[PDB]
Amino acid sequence: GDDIYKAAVEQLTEEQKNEFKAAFDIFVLGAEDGCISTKELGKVMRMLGQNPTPEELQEMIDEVDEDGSGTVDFDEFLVMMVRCMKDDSKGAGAGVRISADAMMQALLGARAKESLDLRAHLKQVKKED
Ligand SMILES: Cc1cc2c(cc1F)OC[C@@H](NS(=O)(=O)c1cc(C(=O)N3CC(C)(C#N)C3)c(C)[nH]1)C2
Ligand SMILES: [Ca+2]
């Protein structure tokens, strides 16, 4: 069940979508539909500093895929990206776990700081002390 996560993307801020967007550019490198599949994911995952398997890879894509087409778009990446950094995507299953912050370091790099969570800065018509 993904009701809270799927909604998380909505809570995100304009800066968030962009911060993560730049990552998809590299994450979907070569992809025909700019989506992340077993091929693309396998490339990045390996570059992150690990050595996953082709069978497990597909499990991740579908594990995050909302429709289950076989790949992940820019939106399907945010839904998981939220829980990825929160480390609450699985809870307590297996040691296997991808780092959201560490991932960006591969795609874009160190171009993701507090600014990423601009949502906290100010995205409404109000102010407090
Ligand atoms: C398309 C997409 C999906 C996911 C991505 C990043 C993406 F690009 O990252 C998070 C992933 N969910 S997960 O539960 O962390 C997770 C990690 C793994 C895995 O194969 N391994 C971790 C490993 C490298 C080790 N040790 C082996 C599995 C099976 N689930 C789902
Ligand atoms: Ca899909």
Which residue, by CA, sits nearest to atom 31 of ligand 1? 60
Whether 119 is in a domain gets the answer no
Whether 34 is in a domain gets the answer yes
The CA-based dihedral angle spanning residues 89, 95, 99, 105, taken in that order and rounded to the nearest 10 degrees: -160
CA-to-CA dists, residue 128 to 13, 25, 117, 122, 123, angstroms = 19, 37, 18, 11, 13
Whether 32 is in a domain gets the answer yes
Burial 66-80 (b: 16+ CB within 10 A, else e): eeeeebbbbebbbbb
Experimental method: NMR
The CB of 87 under 6 Å from ligand 1? The reply is: no
CB 27 within 8 Å of CB 38:
no
CATH number of the domain residue 26 falls in: 1.10.238.10
Backbone torsions φ then ψ of 91, nearest 5 degrees: 95, -75
> How many Å lie between the centroid of ligand 2 and the Cα of residue 8?
18
The domain tally of the chain equals 1
The CB of 96 under 6 Å from ligand 1? The reply is: yes
Whether 50 is in a domain gets the answer yes
Whether 121 is in a domain gets the answer no
Count Cβ atoms within 10 A of the Cβ of residue 94 and give its class: 0-12 exposed, 13-18 middle, 19 or more buried: exposed
Ligand 2 ion: Cβ-proximal residues, 5 Å cutoff: 65, 67, 69, 71
The CB of 61 under 6 Å from ligand 1? The reply is: yes
Domain residue limits at 66 = 4-111
